[PDB]
Amino acid sequence: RAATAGVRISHPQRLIDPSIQASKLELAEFHARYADLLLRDLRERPVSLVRGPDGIGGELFFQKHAARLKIPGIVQLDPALDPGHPPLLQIRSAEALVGAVQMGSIEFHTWNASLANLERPDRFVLDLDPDPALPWKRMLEATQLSLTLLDELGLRAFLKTSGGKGMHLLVPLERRHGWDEVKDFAQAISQHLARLMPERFSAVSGPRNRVGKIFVDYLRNSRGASTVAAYSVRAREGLPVSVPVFREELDSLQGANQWNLRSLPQRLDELAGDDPWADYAGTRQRISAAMRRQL
């Protein structure tokens, strides 16, 4: 089990994605090899699991809590954090990560807060959701415009493909605000963009509320909500991965799922050390009165 963080994998040959012949064992080995990459995000954050016992061709179970875990190393958080429910979950090691895969996990989504203080978010996320029949170029132009606004606000943003159909923008924040304050700020940004360019942006959820447009989703900022982790796999055809990218290579992207679990190695080799999010952990910023004025 040297290639699976010492974890025994049952039914190693069952297919996670028949389209590319990706087995459960391959998925486990991927999480073992890149555990450190995924842990850059999961190590100190509560995590929600997307489990697919029958592969992407079957259904998916979105799990937040668990009473009994057959995942050696997984951490069960204090029920007091979410009364009326079994313990939340936290993965802090390669063994726990692979163990989760062994139990059917395919995707990992983390909270916008870390164990240091789960009542003060350390980031907010803007998830751009486009109309299914909208040209990819629209997503690129919308992402560029969103970053321009963030620059004016004086906020540093970190971009990543979702692995699905849109882009994700993560903005770290000092733990000085409560959940409602951060969410309202994120919503204010979405509404601001919708007011400036109603032809491009929408601040209201629901496909019927973004026909031919892009919805700047701010709902992922609710306490308990989560967002797919950078470098994590998506339970979709081709097993695409959510990949951090430089703002300078944005216009060169051709799709939110251009990278997959098998092409990631090449991505990392091409980068050869260059890290799109090299300045993440070191970023120190907070919501200021000036920002509210601009919004």
Ligand SMILES: Nc1ncnc2c1ncn2[C@H]1C[C@H](O)[C@@H](COP(=O)(O)OP(=O)(O)OP(=O)(O)O)O1
């Ligand atoms: N297996 C799938 N194949 C195609 N579309 C999917 C699949 N699963 C989910 N979707 C679509 C339907 C959902 O309304 C939408 C939101 O996915 P979600 O993971 O919640 O946000 P996301 O940002 O991480 O991915 P996306 O870029 O697609 O929005 O994606």
Ligand SMILES: [Mn+2]
């Ligand atoms: Mn989305």
Ligand SMILES: [Mn+2]
């Ligand atoms: Mn969304």
